[PDB]
């Protein structure tokens, strides 16, 4: 699973998860104009490839970077605001 | 290999064999039973019989709906918050 | 049991191959990571180079994984112990 | 499973677990001369019915009380000393 529930209000999410799938899962309306994937959306929002422990708020969800390297973002943790 | 599957952010598909303590960790609930060790066991206790698909049990601020069950086993519950 | 990582005794575990690598890491305190694998079965296949048969073993970090159930399609179950 | 691994070195144990079963799983040599369940043995070693958080070292395992009430001990967490 690309979106894994760690607990009822916390999700471990592969960066490659399609934005469409995030939107269906969460009831969000994130745009896919500038990205295909949630990792891509996070990078677009921050303007820069983030580091482990960095958090970004997008709509009503907070994404925390769980695993990233100098090349790629691989995993995010999400919770509600 | 996941026992509690989130189908959407507010809805979960749960294996009936999932241990009650693991349900409690996941949801913050405090379920207990001296007759059952699994969430399926608890649902059977509450309903007083082996249920069929569509039967519902409300406990501890969660609603469990029987998603799959036959004449021998209760397999799967769907949970939502009340 | 319903455990994806099932202790058969205090120091030996039967593990569903489909267990996510992150859930292995939480359980064991390992820091496994793959660019190309998301599950422990995937990681075993990566480290061995091929789909293994029952009885094949691989050491990854401080854990030894032996194949317990596999077929011509899939690796299903592993038995793990801590390296000595 | 009356003895469930939460993590590789921490186990959730039903208080009603027979002492013999503890011995099989851990290689302990606890005896059943008085209590014959692990919850009974914890109470016997402490000398009273414990509350959540109480710990007793028995041989090479530490048992911490995880769920108890004013009448019964239900769940223990074990770790190695
Ligand atoms: Zn998962
Ligand atoms: Zn929409
Ligand atoms: Zn990478
Ligand atoms: Zn399932
Ligand atoms: Zn239990
Ligand atoms: Zn019925
Ligand atoms: Zn069946
Ligand atoms: Zn077993
Ligand atoms: Zn994953
Ligand atoms: Zn081979
Ligand atoms: Zn278990
Ligand atoms: Zn005391
Ligand atoms: Zn009890």
Cβ of C20 within 8 Å of Cβ of A14? The answer is no
Other CB atoms within a 10 A radius of the CB of residue D69 amount to 11
Cβ of A4 within 8 Å of Cβ of B6? The answer is yes
DSSP strand pairing (C12-16 vs A10-14): unpaired
- D62 Cβ contact partners less than 8 Å away, ≥ 6 residues apart: D55, D56, D78, D79, D80, D81
Q: Phi, psi (5° rounding) for residue A79?
A: -135, 165
Tell me if there are at least 3 CB pairs under 8 Å linking chains A and D.
Answer: no
- Contact between B45 and B33 (Cβ < 8 Å): yes
> Which of A33, A34, A24, A30 shows the shortest CA–CA distance to A63?
A30
Evaluated on CA atoms D63, D65, D70, D72, the torsion sign reads: negative
The CATH number of whichever domain residue C54 belongs to comes to: 3.30.465.10
Residue ranges of C for the binding site? Answer: 3, 6, 16, 20, 22, 31, 35, 38, 50, 56, 71, 76
Instruction: Give residue for tokens 């209000």.
Output: A9
Domain that holds residue D44: 1-81
Give the SS3 label for residue C77. Answer: strand
Tell me which ligand sits closest to the C-alpha of residue A74: 3
Instruction: Give residue for tokens 């992150």.
Output: C22
- Contact between C3 and C36 (Cβ < 8 Å): no
CA–CA distance, B1 with C15 (Å, rounded to integer): 9
The set of chains that have 3 or more CB pairs under 8 A with C is A, B, D
- D48 Cβ contact partners less than 8 Å away, ≥ 6 residues apart: none
Q: Phi, psi (5° rounding) for residue C79?
A: -115, 125
Tell me which ligand sits closest to the C-alpha of residue B13: 4
Give the SS3 label for residue B9. Answer: coil
Reported structure resolution in angstroms? 1.7
Q: Distances in Å between the alpha carbon of A4 and those of A22, A30, B4, B5?
A: 12, 19, 9, 7
Give me the number of domains chain D comprises.
1
**What is the three-state SS of D3-29?**
EEEEECCEEEEECCCEHHHHHHHHCCC
DSSP string, A7-68: ETTEEEEETT-BHHHHHHHHT-----SS-SBHHHHHHHHHSS---TT-EEEETTEEEEEEEE
| DSSP-H helix ranges across chain C | 21-28, 40-48
For residue A34, how far is its CA from the centre of ligand 4 (angstroms)? 34
- Contact between D78 and D5 (Cβ < 8 Å): no
Give the SS3 label for residue D70. Answer: coil
């Amino acid at each position: 699973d690309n979106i894994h529930a760690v607990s009822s209000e916390r999700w471990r999410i592969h960066a490659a998860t399609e934005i469409e799938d995030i939107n269906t899962f969460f009831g969000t309306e994130y745009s896919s104009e500038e990205a295909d994937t949630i990792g891509g959306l996070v990078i677009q929002e921050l303007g820069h490839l983030p580091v482990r422990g960095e958090k970004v708020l997008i709509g009503g969800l907070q994404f925390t970077v769980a695993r990233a390297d100098n090349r790629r973002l691989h995993t995010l943790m999400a919770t509600r605001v």
